[PDB]
A paper describes a structure:
The structures of VSG21 and VSG545 were also determined, both harboring closely related folds and biochemical properties that distinguish them from other VSGs. Of note is the fact that both structures were obtained with proteolytic removal of the bottom lobe (contained in the C-terminal region of the NTD sequence). This cleavage occurred spontaneously during crystallization experiments performed with full-length VSG21 and the NTD of VSG545 that had been produced by limited proteolysis with Endoproteinase Lys-C (LysC). Presumably these cleavage events in the crystallization experiments occurred from residual contaminating endogenous protease(s) from T. brucei (and/or possibly residual LysC for VSG545). In contrast, for VSG21 and VSG545, the cleavage in the crystallization drops produced a truncated NTD missing the bottom lobe sequence but maintaining the 3-helix bundle and top lobe of the protein. Finally, it should be noted that for VSG545, crystals were only obtained with PNGase treated material, removing the N-linked glycan. VSG21 and VSG545 are more similar to each other than these other VSGs, however, distinguished from them by the tightly twisted nature of the top lobe and, directly beneath it, the presence of a second three-stranded beta-sheet perpendicular to the axis of the 3-helix bundle. VSG21 and VSG545 align well to each other in the top lobe but not to the other VSGs with beta-sheet top lobes. Superpositions with predicted models from AlphaFold (which were accurate enough to solve the experimental structures by molecular replacement) show possible conformations of the full NTD for each protein.
Long-term immune evasion by the African trypanosome is achieved through repetitive cycles of surface protein replacement with antigenically distinct versions of the dense Variant Surface Glycoprotein (VSG) coat. The mature VSG proteins are attached to the cell surface by a GPI-anchor, and consist of two main regions: (1) a large, N-terminal domain (NTD) of roughly 300–400 amino acids that is most distal to the membrane and (2) a smaller, membrane-proximal C-terminal domain (CTD) spanning 80–120 amino acids beneath the NTD that harbors the GPI-anchor. Therefore, at the heart of antigenic variation in the African trypanosome are the NTDs of the VSGs. These large subdomains are elongated folds centered on a three-helix bundle scaffold.
Author numbering:
A (entry chain A): 33 to 171, 192 to 252, 254 to 256, 260 to 298
B (entry chain B): 33 to 173, 192 to 253, 261 to 298
The structure:
Amino acid sequence: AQINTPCDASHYAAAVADNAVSAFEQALGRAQDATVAANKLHLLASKLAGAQKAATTILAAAAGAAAADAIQKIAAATPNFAKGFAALNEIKGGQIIVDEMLKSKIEDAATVAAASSTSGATIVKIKPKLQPATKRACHTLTLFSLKAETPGTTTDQKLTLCGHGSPSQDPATASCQNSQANLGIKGGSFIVKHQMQTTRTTGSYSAIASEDTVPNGDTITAQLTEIAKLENAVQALQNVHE
Amino acid sequence: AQINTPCDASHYAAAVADNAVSAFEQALGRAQDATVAANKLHLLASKLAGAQKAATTILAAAAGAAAADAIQKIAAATPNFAKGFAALNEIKGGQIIVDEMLKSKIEDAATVAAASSTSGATIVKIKPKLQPATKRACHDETLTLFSLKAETPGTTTDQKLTLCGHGSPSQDPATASCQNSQANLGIKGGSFIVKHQMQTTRTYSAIASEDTVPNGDTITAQLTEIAKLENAVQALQNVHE
């Protein structure tokens, strides 16, 4: 559970989805094997003779009962399995978006003369910056959320009105000073990464406290309650035996 | 399609997922019917005599064979059904965030005297503002997708995402208008991100790569698997007794 970034949590959800689909396919394969065994055992028993023909028909009837019971259990487990699978992939996509959103920032503005800062093309604009991944994004459970960064409380601090005694100075390198002769903007990250934990199996998937972040805790909780249905359906699917 | 907001595309994809699960459950139920029919038909044919027995077992064997076929089809579609289902519910789960992040905005800063605007507690801070849904998000209390573009600041005075000058202190940009005066300083903020429409084609054409989040390559790779979802849905719709 080395979940340090939201992409790691999305890949962990991908691994859980892989194990769930593998369990479903194993149950379907056991049902197919029981049905094939029932058909072939019947067809072989038809050409046998005597008490061995009787024993072969008993085995064929047991195989057909096993096939019917397995298909019944799989059809019973299908709905909650699909529900939790859908909610799990929703959490995975939401973690993809929150991971690619963490690299957003407010670009720093170069200092300009104070007379040419509240008007004209030289206005000290606040410029958003989005940073999409270079190609393919994202390429005791832990999840993540987007929090608003708190702005700084002094001169040389993030998301503040930078001041300089000379114009054309970059906040990213030169430090800010208590001056109104030239005005600029010291930016910073627009969103910070908030951790969330949801420790899990009596017989239930924790409860993440609701916050003021995106996603809010109510949404993550509503998705976790369906993921619990998925894991219960997986425990039901594995319990079939052939 | 009637998709106008990013939150609506999630409900469209959810309806598509419900139709896919409906097709899956119908195929599994048809296999269940064939299996129970073969089982009970064999048990009845054992209780008969004469050609009426042979007439029944033949039919029972048919109910066996088709049953063995049905699972063989269903499992054969199960891989491709999942890879497209997951990505579908990925896209929906992404669209819930985009919509919920569309309300993000940079707050306005009340004007303050220039002498106390570049230092101390009285600095003009650029304060981020998130607006999460009061309860569950998106839950009250050719495709049409959406993505998050960057906002563009204005070019003059009294424009969005600019330094607001004013001749008097304690003025709020939401009510006061900015003026070319350096005596008092504040911030005229606005939305941090804008909506950006996205589209595909039913026959899935790779959407042009973006400068936005979600990236064009990511939504493209997910739309590639949604086609496998529809293929497995058709294969599940072509199995019957």
